[PDB]
Amino acid sequence: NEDLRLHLLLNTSVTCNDGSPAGYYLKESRGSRRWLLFLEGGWYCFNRENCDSRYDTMRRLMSSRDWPRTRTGTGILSSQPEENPYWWNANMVFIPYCSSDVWSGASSKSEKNEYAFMGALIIQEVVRELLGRGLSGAKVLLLAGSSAGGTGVLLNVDRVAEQLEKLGYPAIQVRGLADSGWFLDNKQYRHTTCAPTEAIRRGIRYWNGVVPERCRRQFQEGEEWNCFFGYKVYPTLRSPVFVVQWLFDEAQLTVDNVHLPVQEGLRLYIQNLGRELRHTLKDVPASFAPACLSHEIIIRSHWTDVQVKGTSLPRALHCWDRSLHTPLKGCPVHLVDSCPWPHCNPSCPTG
Ligand SMILES: *[C@@H]1O[C@H](CO)[C@@H](O)[C@H](O)[C@H]1NC(C)=O
Ligand SMILES: CC(=O)N1CCc2c1ccc(Cl)c2Cl
């Protein structure tokens, strides 16, 4: 099945990196008032030099020129209850990542600018055009996303909520689901701008990157890079946000320059990383954090398989839905592994 259909943005001034129109894939579900808007990930580029390289061999992340007319919804975007016990009947939207800016930019390609970085505006424009296609009648809009899309959720969920309030739709409940987008600005295991802190600092300047207002007001000018880190930006958010995060995320380990017989130094580094991640989730009431070495989960077809403390992610998300109607009997929403080494959870993806 190729069930989500491409719509290029009617406002063609909201563009991918190269000035081609951004867009979204839609599969409508009549009668359902649930809308799932999923932000694709795919790293980023923070200067002309690496953006030019990304344009040569990763061009679909920078242009809509070669996008197919349809995409198959998989995992949480699947309409089959067997693949998606959580939201199989929802209206499904897949928003391709073609701005290379962690969904934070609001700058057009112009005289001074070889590339457009419009991720924040892309989300705004998708939401605006969807209101005329059924979203106006929604009761829940779940803004989900994986990897850089997961960080995009944290950066944009409150802006979507404010956008709908100002447009006159206060009844739509905007919620966030951030998958694999909860990073630590930690010490690298070996020094190498791959390090998470420096990459984001350069990005905002290059991108015209914007961050949630309450977080911006805490860290102030020149320090907005802090708001790309989940444990710093999450406490400032008003919309409900469910956090999915492997304790030993492969992209975290990459920017940490960890490449997998492990000796004491690396063992301690890996164990400290998991404990740090676990600590940052202690006060996140809706979270699913398995002790696995892996990367993304929610649009993979076997996303149903992993469990924490006996509860799957689709179940935990259903429990979260119920909690948003005191804790529920047999329906937990805070699921963080406590064991300290990759794959100490037997349900981790096999690879
Ligand atoms: C098109 O999008 C741009 C970027 O946000 C915005 O400035 C402009 O007002 C939009 N125009 C229309 C007609 O929607
Ligand atoms: C793969 C990816 O997308 N990565 C890895 C590091 C990172 C990403 C996305 C957002 C932020 Cl803040 C950070 Cl540190």
Q: Decide whether any atom of ligand 1 lies within 6 Å of the 281 Cβ.
A: no
What's the CA gap between 52 and 214, in Å, rounded?
A: 34
Burial of 64 (0-12, 13-18, 19+ CB in 10 A): buried
Active site annotation includes 295: yes
Q: Which ligand does the CA of 41 lie closest to?
A: 2
- What is the dihedral angle through the alpha carbons of 125, 228, 321, 246, rounded to the nearest 10 degrees? 130
CA gap 294, 292 in Å, rounded: 6
Q: How far apart are CA 39 and CA 177, in angstroms?
A: 10
Q: How many residues does the chain have?
A: 351
Per the entry, the structure determination technique was X-ray
Q: Which two tokens stand for residue 100?
A: 């290379």
What lines the ligand 2 site, CB under 6 Å?
A: 41, 43, 102, 147-148, 151, 183, 196, 200, 228-229, 251, 255
**Phi, then psi, of 54 in degrees rounded to 5:** -60, -35
Tokens 């209101």 — which residue?
A: 131
**Helical (H) or strand (E) element with 176:** strand 173-179
Specify the pairing of strand 311-312 against strand 307-308.
antiparallel
The total domain count for the chain is 1
Which one of the listed residues 147, 239, 294, 312 is annotated catalytic?
147
Resolution, given in Å to one decimal, reads 1.5
| Cβ neighbours for 92, distance < 8 A, ≥ 6 positions apart | 3, 4, 26, 27, 29, 36, 38, 73, 77, 79
Strands 70-71 and 4-8: antiparallel
Q: Which of 103, 180, 183 to mutate to test the pocket of ligand 2 (most atoms within 8 A of CB)?
A: 183
CA distance 189 to 253: 9
Q: Which of 40, 102, 232 to mutate to test the pocket of ligand 2 (most atoms within 8 A of CB)?
A: 102
> Could you give the 3-state DSSP secondary structure of residue 52?
helix
Contact 153, 303 (CB under 8 A): no
123: closest CA among 230, 229, 23, 6? 23
Q: How far is the CA of 63 from the centre of ligand 2 (A)?
A: 20
Take residue 41 and report the two structure tokens written for it.
């990930």
CA–CA separation, 203 and 209 (whole Å)? 7
How far from the centroid of its chain's Cα atoms is residue 117's Cα?
17
Decide if 169 contacts 160 (C-beta within 8 A). Answer: no
- As for the chain, the residues directly before each break of C–N over 2.5 Å are 192, 260, 325
What is the CB neighbour count within 10 angstroms for residue 174? 26
HEC secondary structure over 277-335? HHHHHCCCCCEEECCCEECCCCCCCCCCCCEECCEEHHHHHHHHHHHCCCCECCECCEE
Residue 26: CA count within 13 A, CB half-sphere: 18
Its domain, for residue 164, covers 1-351
Contact by Cβ (8 Å): 120, 156: yes
Q: Find the 113 Cα to ligand 1 centroid distance in Å.
A: 18
